[PDB]
Amino acid sequence: GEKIMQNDRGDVIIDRYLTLDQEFDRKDDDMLLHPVKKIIDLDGNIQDDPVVRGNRPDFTMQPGVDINGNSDGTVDILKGMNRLSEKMIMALKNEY
Amino acid sequence: GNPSLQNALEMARGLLLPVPAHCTREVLIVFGSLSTTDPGDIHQTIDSLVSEKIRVKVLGLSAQVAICKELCKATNYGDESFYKILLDETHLKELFNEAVTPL
Amino acid sequence: MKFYIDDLPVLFPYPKIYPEQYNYMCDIKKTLDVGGNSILEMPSGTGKTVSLLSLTIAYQMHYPEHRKIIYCSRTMSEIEKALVELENLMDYRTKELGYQEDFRGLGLTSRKNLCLHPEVSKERKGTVVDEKCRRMTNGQAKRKLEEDPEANVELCEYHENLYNIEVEDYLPKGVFSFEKLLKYCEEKTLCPYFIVRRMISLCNIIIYSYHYLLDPKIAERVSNEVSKDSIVIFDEAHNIDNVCIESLSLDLTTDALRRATRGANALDERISEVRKVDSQKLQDEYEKLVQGLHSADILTDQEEPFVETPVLPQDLLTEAIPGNIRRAEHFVSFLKRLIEYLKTRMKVLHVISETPKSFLQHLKQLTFIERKPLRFCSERLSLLVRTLEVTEVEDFTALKDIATFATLISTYEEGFLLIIEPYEIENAAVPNPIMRFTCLDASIAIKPVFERFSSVIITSGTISPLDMYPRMLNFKTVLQKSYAMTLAKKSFLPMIITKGSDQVAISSRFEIRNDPSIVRNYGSMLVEFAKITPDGMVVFFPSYLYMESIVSMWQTMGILDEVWKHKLILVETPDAQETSLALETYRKACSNGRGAILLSVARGKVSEGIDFDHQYGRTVLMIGIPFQYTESRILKARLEFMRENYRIRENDFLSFDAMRHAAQCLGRVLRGKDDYGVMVLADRRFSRKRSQLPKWIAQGLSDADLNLSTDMAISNTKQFLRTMAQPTDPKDQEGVSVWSYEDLIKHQNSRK
Amino acid sequence: PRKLQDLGLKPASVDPATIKRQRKGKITNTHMTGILKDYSHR
Amino acid sequence: NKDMCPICKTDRYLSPDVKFLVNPECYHRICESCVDRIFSLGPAQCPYKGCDKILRKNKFKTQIFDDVEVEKEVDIRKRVFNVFNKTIDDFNGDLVEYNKYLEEVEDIIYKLDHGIDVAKTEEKLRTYEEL
Ligand code: SF4
Numbered sequence A: 001g002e003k004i005m006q007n008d009r010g011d012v013i014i015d016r017y018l019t020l021d022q023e024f025d026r027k028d029d030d031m032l033l034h035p036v037k038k039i040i041d042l043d044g045n046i047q048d049d050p051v052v053r054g055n056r057p058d059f060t061m062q063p064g065v066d067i068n069g070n071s072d073g074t075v076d077i078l079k080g081m082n083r084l085s086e087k088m089i090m091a092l093k094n095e096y
Numbered sequence B: 001g002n003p004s005l006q007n008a009l010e011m012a013r014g015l016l017l018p019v020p021a022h023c024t025r026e027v028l029i030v031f032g033s034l035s036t037t038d039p040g041d042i043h044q045t046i047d048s049l050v051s052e053k054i055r056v057k058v059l060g061l062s063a064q065v066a067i068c069k070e071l072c073k074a075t076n077y078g079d080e081s082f083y084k085i086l087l088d089e090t091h092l093k094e095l096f097n098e099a100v101t102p103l
Numbered sequence C: 001m002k003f004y005i006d007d008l009p010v011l012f013p014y015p016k017i018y019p020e021q022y023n024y025m026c027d028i029k030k031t032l033d034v035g036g037n038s039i040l041e042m043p044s045g046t047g048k049t050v051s052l053l054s055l056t057i058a059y060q061m062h063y064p065e066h067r068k069i070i071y072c073s074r075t076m077s078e079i080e081k082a083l084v085e086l087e088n089l090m091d092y093r094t095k096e097l098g099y100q101e102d103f104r105g106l107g108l109t110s111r112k113n114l115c116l117h118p119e120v121s122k123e124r125k126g127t128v129v130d131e132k133c134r135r136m137t138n139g140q141a142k143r144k145l146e147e148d149p150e151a152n153v154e155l156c157e158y159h160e161n162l163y164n165i166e167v168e169d170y171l172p173k174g175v176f177s178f179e180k181l182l183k184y185c186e187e188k189t190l191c192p193y194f195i196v197r198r199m200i201s202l203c204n205i206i207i208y209s210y211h212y213l214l215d216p217k218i219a220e221r222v223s224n225e226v227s228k229d230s231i232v233i234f235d236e237a238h239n240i241d242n243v244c245i246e247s248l249s250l251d252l253t254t255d256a257l258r259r260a261t262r263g264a265n266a267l268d269e270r271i272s273e274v275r276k277v278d279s280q281k282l283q284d285e286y287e288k289l290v291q292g293l294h295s296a297d298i299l300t301d302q303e304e305p306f307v308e309t310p311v312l313p314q315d316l317l318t319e320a321i322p323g324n325i326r327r328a329e330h331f332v333s334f335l336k337r338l339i340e341y342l343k344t345r346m347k348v349l350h351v352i353s354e355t356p357k358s359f360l361q362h363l364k365q366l367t368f369i370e371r372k373p374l375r376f377c378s379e380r381l382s383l384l385v386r387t388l389e390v391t392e393v394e395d396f397t398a399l400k401d402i403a404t405f406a407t408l409i410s411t412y413e414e415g416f417l418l419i420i421e422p423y424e425i426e427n428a429a430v431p432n433p434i435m436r437f438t439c440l441d442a443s444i445a446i447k448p449v450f451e452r453f454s455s456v457i458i459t460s461g462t463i464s465p466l467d468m469y470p471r472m473l474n475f476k477t478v479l480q481k482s483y484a485m486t487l488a489k490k491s492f493l494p495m496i497i498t499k500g501s502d503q504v505a506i507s508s509r510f511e512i513r514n515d516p517s518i519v520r521n522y523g524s525m526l527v528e529f530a531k532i533t534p535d536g537m538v539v540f541f542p543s544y545l546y547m548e549s550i551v552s553m554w555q556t557m558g559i560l561d562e563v564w565k566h567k568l569i570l571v572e573t574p575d576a577q578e579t580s581l582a583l584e585t586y587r588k589a590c591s592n593g594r595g596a597i598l599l600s601v602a603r604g605k606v607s608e609g610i611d612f613d614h615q616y617g618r619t620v621l622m623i624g625i626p627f628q629y630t631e632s633r634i635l636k637a638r639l640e641f642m643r644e645n646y647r648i649r650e651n652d653f654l655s656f657d658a659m660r661h662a663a664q665c666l667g668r669v670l671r672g673k674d675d676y677g678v679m680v681l682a683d684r685r686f687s688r689k690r691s692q693l694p695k696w697i698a699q700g701l702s703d704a705d706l707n708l709s710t711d712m713a714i715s716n717t718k719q720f721l722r723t724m725a726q727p728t729d730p731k732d733q734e735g736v737s738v739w740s741y742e743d744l745i746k747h748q749n750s751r752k
Numbered sequence D: 001p002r003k004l005q006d007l008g009l010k011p012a013s014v015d016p017a018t019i020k021r022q023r024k025g026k027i028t029n030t031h032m033t034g035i036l037k038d039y040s041h042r
Numbered sequence E: 001n002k003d004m005c006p007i008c009k010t011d012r013y014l015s016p017d018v019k020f021l022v023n024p025e026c027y028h029r030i031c032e033s034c035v036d037r038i039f040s041l042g043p044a045q046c047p048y049k050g051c052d053k054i055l056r057k058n059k060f061k062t063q064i065f066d067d068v069e070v071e072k073e074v075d076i077r078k079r080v081f082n083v084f085n086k087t088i089d090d091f092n093g094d095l096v097e098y099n100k101y102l103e104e105v106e107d108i109i110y111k112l113d114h115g116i117d118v119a120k121t122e123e124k125l126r127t128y129e130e131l
């Protein structure tokens, strides 16, 4: 969950798996994503009004950005720890 | 370490398996932590304990854990009074002396 | 149980009743007999929804008028919860009366939530779902397939099966929640959306969101079908002003203007091609516009305009098209030069705060565009898009944005303000200009609602102060009151934490978010609370960027590593799907006793609608007061409008909005008087805001807890969780905290 | 590098380094000469 | 180029002194330096290749809009609306005749914009402004 910085050396042998680790992270969302009940359907709450065009939320209500406007990667660690929590929970969902 | 309610309940299920049908199968848990880590699903273990007619009474130490309350409610046929939490020394002694009586 | 209020029999679906519920029914029945607007604040935790539904259904059935019930909630999830409670209530009523009476109850939402079509199901945007369903169900596809059976266009079989059966035969009588309606329509191969949208005039009660009553882009069709004497319930209406402002607001960016230029060029190419092929399909539209027919006359009932009407229908002009935009090419040139004027206004180096009148005068003197042709821009654009019969509509969405902007800024001049900021975000290196047309007056959107309906029941669990809203929204209340729950034992223990363990004052001001002392105090507090909370924790932050910074540096300083030893950490992502997965993961981890902590925005998606009852609550760790970004221009303009028009102070309004967001965060922890959970508020500035809390939270907040540090807050929380882990005495709560039927009869006799 | 700004063009060069830059005392504990160690730092 | 002046061939980058000077007769991206070069001595033909229209220095102006076609449409609308200025008060509240007048003025503006009937429309607007 640490923020990755380009100044760190890493390890050239291990870092070849970084793209394939991101591929595994993408594959982990495949069997984790499933329709939920309407009681906690937060996706459908923002889709209740699809043609809403109100004022755009400010930068406090939005994820952080760099000087160039690109993502600073702090949401990546949030998605990573949420994925880790989901993986721990779905590991209990087995035949054991 | 870090307690495992599912491992304890599975081992209790294994130990209470050769118990004859006339003998009542009961599990007393002196649980102190507020969170537990399980290798697998604990609701399957709860269903297996209910199917094996095992009544679980849990003596909590810190607060009312929801999984222990649900386990006591399911294993005691909807009775929520089998999840006991102490208050002090004397309440702990009274709760320990309450469990010697047959259910 | 079954009991009587005055002459009204009430079938409460529970064998026991809270006293606050009975007082709530008494107040609602008094309001409905008088026939006025009211603001009623029950405490959260008590059965507000079941009380509302029970009394309103009893009033509708027993009294002969059978007044329709409009239960306007804030989110679709709360709509589904109200539908579930209504289903339980009608099951109890059927059991008690021995029969299922003639009754219809449905929930109304968008096509995305009610699309059983397997093709257009995986689309992540509601707009493309609407446009694909419209493409398959405009009737143009149906007549094209009727004239040409070999045409490549297809029809939605769920929509087509509804033509076989009547409107009254769409569903069996009763109440259909979204899950049950989706299952039934999947079994019978029907579209649930068009079933709901056609039965609005037939439903005794219809439950939809505030957007379907306040936003005129979608409330135009809904408000015609509903009865004008119906009972209207505003549930959780403490943020109804945000919906009112968002209804009549629009933000334009330079990318939107570029896509508008591209769409105008594409529209010019399309009108040139159609004029080359067939000018009759334009000539008939032109002569119909000469006759004075509007969009409602030209468009059929089963089709919808391409550009939704962005303004109130009472503010729409009744006279014909002026003629500057009557011809298709003339309107295309008009729209193109309007977009070019917007691009010219977009290029500026500072912020302009100008009224719509000044903008219209500048546009007229520089472009010769008048206000009256601008007022017909959306209708003319929708008619042109219909008559062009374009298959693709993806290139004309920015044209919808431009038409919405033009109609909004032409029809409205008072209570609105146009803000052009050279920097949308200050963190960007290259400037990104943005044009914001905001709505300063929140009463504009809700004004026709109070005109149309005589009796409106505004209700939230955490609406406080009650008198703020009649000043904010121009309506009169016959009676307003806030209940405090009667408890045998103090079910919830709020405290205000003003300092850390080392007595260092803690605050969540955005400028001091990088202070290691405050972040260390918050991390130690969160670690101790995760150590002492049994089931789960929900943590609320003033802003998502504050969460991002503080969680990143918590993981840098290793606080979260200590948190992982006890509770799983789940964070509200900006993606709604991943947030829903995180929320159900949180509920699963709280259910099995693994223990979980949820980090959410106090103004985010999780803060509205989502409830944390029993094990899902147990602690609301509020990191700081959820103030808005103070120096944002929209908020400052709204504050100036509130000060000038209603004499509401800027600091008072900011404190009120932040405190009501904090209150709605605290109201999610309780459901039922058996439920318990602490409400800890980690900022130094809550201590003066005890009076701005809701009345019941103020009663629950002792005076000794107003300036706690971390350590005695932890000790009090441990003592509290040990205290109500004990079984309560039934004799201590037999007739003081919860009533049986006999207790209700005794109180009824004691009142008279 | 300081006259490009005078003409409106942005220079990538900062101004160069031409414009504007900058006992042993006596011992009494003679029975532990060499047993004690020097500590010039904490 | 939208940034560079083809007549004098100077970038905005190393020469930020160029300006968006255009001519109503023929809209060309020509800087102020080229305008003060060519047309200060006298009227001349358009320095853009393929065009030879006569044009004056005092008729030069800056372009408000980025689009050339929108700019020339707005300029033609300005050249028409000065003499074509009947209002609803001029029509004594006749809404239908006012809409017909709006259609007619938009049609002649379109005709002047595309030049399809420039001679007849020009003669008509001369005869209208002579009153
Ligand atoms: S008619 Fe219903 S099921 Fe068919 S595409 Fe439209 S919303 Fe989906």
Ligand SMILES: [Zn+2]
Binding pocket: none
């Ligand atoms: Zn010097």
Ligand SMILES: [Zn+2]
Binding pocket: E005, E006, E007, E008, E009, E010, E030, E031, E032, E033, E034
């Ligand atoms: Zn030049």
Ligand SMILES: [Zn+2]
Binding pocket: E025, E026, E027, E028, E046, E047, E048, E051, E052, E053
């Ligand atoms: Zn030329």
